Amino acid sequence: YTSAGNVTCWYQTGIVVPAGTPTSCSIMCFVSACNDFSVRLLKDTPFI
C-alpha cells in the first residue's frame, strides 16, 4: 500500500565468537542523498 521499493537483511550464517567476548551486538544505518537530487514547489512544513 506504498508502491515503493524495500530493503531487508537476513542471517546467512550466525555470529561466532571466541571465549570471553560479549554475545550480542548492534548494527547502525546512515542515510544521505546523492548529487542528483531535485526539489520543487516550496510549501509549508507539517511539523510546527
Binding site: 506504498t2 515503493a4 521499493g5 524495500n6 530493503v7 531487508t8 537483511c9 537476513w10 542471517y11 546467512q12 550464517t13 550466525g14 555470529i15 565468537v17 554475545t23 550480542s24 551486538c25 548492534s26 548494527i27 547502525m28 544505518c29 546512515f30 542515510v31 544521505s32 542523498a33 546523492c34 542528483d36 537530487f37 531535485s38 526539489v39 520543487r40 514547489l41 516550496l42 510549501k43 512544513t45 507539517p46 511539523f47
Partner: protein, 58 residues
C-alpha cells in the same frame, strides 16, 4: 513501542546463537513519508517541497 525516547531507537539488535535464516530487519524506502526516514536531515528538507526526486545512499 517502549523505546521511542532512548538511544536504543537507533540500534539494530544482532542476537547470539544459531539462527541462520531469520530476518534481521526490513523497511520500505520512502523518505519524507515513512516514520523511520521522516525526521532525518534528508527527511526534514524534503518536507518543505511538494515534489522531489533523486537517488539515495544507505
Amino acid at each position: 513501542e517502549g523505546k521511542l525516547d532512548t538511544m536504543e531507537i537507533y540500534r539494530i539488535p544482532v542476537q547470539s546463537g544459531n539462527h541462520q535464516s531469520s530476518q534481521v530487519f526490513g523497511f520500505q524506502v520512502q523518505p519524507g513519508l515513512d516514520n523511520v526516514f521522516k525526521h532525518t536531515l534528508l527527511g526534514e528538507i524534503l518536507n518543505y517541497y511538494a515534489h522531489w526526486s533523486g537517488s539515495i545512499k544507505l
